[PDB]
């Protein structure tokens, strides 16, 4: 019904977003922006690791979508360079699927922490994580921009994985007016 199937309607001059981490291996991570799925099963571009959607804040257009596997390969470096290359006045949306920490290295953690992440250095194996960043401007303090959920045997929604987490909000379009 509502933009990105939001619980409450967004205020007028705002960009709607909904970020969903993966829930175990069968429930996929999803990035929704302005009622359009940027990353997800639907668009066939979601995978294990850290999934990043980059949007031009000024035009509201998707500029890039890329995933980086943190269980295999050496994708931490290519992820840090992808994040660092992002142009100013960009929105960055980051979600975990399955695992985003095994091979997660310092350079990548520093590039994400530079964007305002308080949880990227607390990432544990299979912790579910969702994050909204702005490059070249500040997001309002009121919007939910980050969440982390660690694997815990008593709380785990799946055998071996924590429950998926979500953040939904409305970003005002005039932060650079």
Q: Can you give the resolution of this entry in Å?
A: 2.3
Helix, coil or strand: residue 4 = helix
Helix, coil or strand: residue 11 = coil
The domain in which residue 130 lies consists of 1-177
Residue with tokens 């699927």: 97
| Cα angle, residue 172 at apex, residues 171 and 177 outer, rounded to 5° | 140
The rounded distance, in Å, linking the Cα atoms of 114 and 112 is: 5
Q: What residues contact 58, with CB distance under 8 A and at least 6 apart?
A: 89, 176
Q: Phi/psi of residue 66, each to 5°? A: -150, 145
Q: Which two tokens stand for residue 153?
A: 């045997």
What's the distance, CA 134 to chain centroid?
A: 12
Q: What residues contact 28, with CB distance under 8 A and at least 6 apart?
A: 22, 40, 41, 46, 97
- DSSP for 26-84 reads TB--EEEETTEEEESTTTT---SEEEEEEEETTT--EEEEEEE-SSSSS-HHHHHHHHH
* Number of domains within the chain: 1
The method of structure determination was: X-ray
Helix, coil or strand: residue 27 = strand
- What is the C-alpha R_g of the chain? 15
Helix, coil or strand: residue 118 = coil
Q: Ramachandran region of residue 116, left (φ > 0), alpha (ψ -120 to 50) or beta?
A: left
Cβ–Cβ < 8 Å for 164, 26 = no
The rounded distance, in Å, linking the Cα atoms of 19 and 4 is: 9
| Cα angle, residue 160 at apex, residues 69 and 32 outer, rounded to 5° | 50
Cβ–Cβ < 8 Å for 10, 16 = yes
């Amino acid at each position: 019904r509502q933009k990105c199937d939001h619980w409450s309607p967004c205020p007028p001059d705002t960009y709607a977003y909904r970020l969903l981490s993966g829930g175990g291996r069968d429930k996929y991570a999803k990035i929704c922006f302005e009622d359009e799925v940027l990353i997800g099963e639907k668009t066939g571009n979601v995978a294990r690791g850290i999934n990043i959607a980059v949007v031009n804040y000024e035009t509201g257009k998707v500029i890039a979508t890329k995933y980086f596997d943190m269980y295999e390969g050496d994708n931490s470096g290519p992820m840090a360079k992808f994040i660092q290359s992002t142009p100013s006045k960009s929105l960055l949306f980051m979600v975990t699927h399955d695992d985003g920490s095994s091979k997660l290295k310092a350079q990548a953690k520093d590039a994400i922490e530079a964007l305002g992440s308080k949880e990227i250095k607390n990432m544990k194996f299979r912790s579910s994580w969702v994050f909204v960043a702005a490059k070249g401007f500040e997001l309002p303090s009121e919007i939910e921009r980050e969440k982390i959920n660690h694997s815990d045997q008593s709380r785990n929604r799946y055998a071996g994985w924590p429950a998926e987490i979500q953040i939904e909000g409305c970003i005002p379009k005039g932060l650079r007016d």
